[PDB]
């Protein structure tokens, strides 16, 4: 127990992972060596605590989007978001479910009686609203 | 007539008790019947998977 890492190591690990994600890897004994030259760390204990947290954070990064930024994950996001645009829209459906109450609204706006509109049967019962209070 | 001394094996530890931490409550199942199991407070260091003897069948059952 008592193995909590403080701001001094966590912020440094996040910064060096952001700057040198490509060079860094899954090996603790190699991350401790790259930490020799990527930053000036006054103490060996501080440097290997930082290296251990770096390896832990890289294990987290290889699976998920940790708050520490990474250019590969950033460009993958910037791809997914602007892409997977479907070849056919979800808004060009041939038939559209239209309530008769909603149907009269289009009549005033004189855009009703379209082919894609299908006048359904409105629900009967008015059974909405949850039972009040407990039970 | 009197109930004989029997054995019960600890399956789970339910945490300390006794107003000083001096007892720990453990769920124990009788070696005679696996299904039949109760909870008893015992003293001394206890870990799951050990057998302790009982001089009586029922003494106590409560949840804290």
């Amino acid at each position: 127990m008592g193995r909590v890492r403080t701001k001094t190591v966590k912020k440094a690990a996040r910064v060096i992972i952001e700057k040198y994600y490509t060079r860094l890897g899954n090996d603790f004994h190699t991350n401790k060596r790259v930490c020799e030259e990527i930053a000036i760390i006054p103490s060996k204990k501080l440097r290997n605590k930082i290296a251990g947290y770096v390896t832990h954070l890289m294990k987290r990064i290889q699976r998920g989007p940790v708050r520490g930024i990474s250019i590969k994950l950033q460009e993958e996001e910037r791809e997914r978001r602007d892409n997977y645009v479907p070849e056919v829209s979800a808004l060009d459906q041939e038939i559209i479910e239209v309530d008769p109450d909603t149907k009269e609204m289009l009549k005033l706006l004189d855009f009703g009686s379209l082919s894609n509109l299908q006048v359904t049967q409105p629900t009967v019962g008015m059974n909405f609203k949850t039972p009040r209070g407990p039970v | 007539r009197v109930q004989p001394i029997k054995l019960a094996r600890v399956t789970k530890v339910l945490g300390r008790t006794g107003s000083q931490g001096q007892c720990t409550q453990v769920r124990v199942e009788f070696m005679d019947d696996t299904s039949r199991s109760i909870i008893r407070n015992v003293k001394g260091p206890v870990r799951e998977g050990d057998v302790l003897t009982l001089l009586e069948s029922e003494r106590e059952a409560r949840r804290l």
Partner: protein, 32 residues
């Protein structure tokens, strides 16, 4: 070390700034 001490603060971590070094070009080979 004149105006003060030389050792940095023990908890002060300074990270050097790298260059770009992206190199997205095709694989070539300089001959020299």
């Amino acid at each position: 070390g004149k105006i003060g001490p030389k050792k940095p603060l023990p908890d002060h971590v300074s990270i050097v700034e790298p260059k770009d070094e992206i190199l997205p070009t095709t694989p070539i080979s300089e001959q020299k």
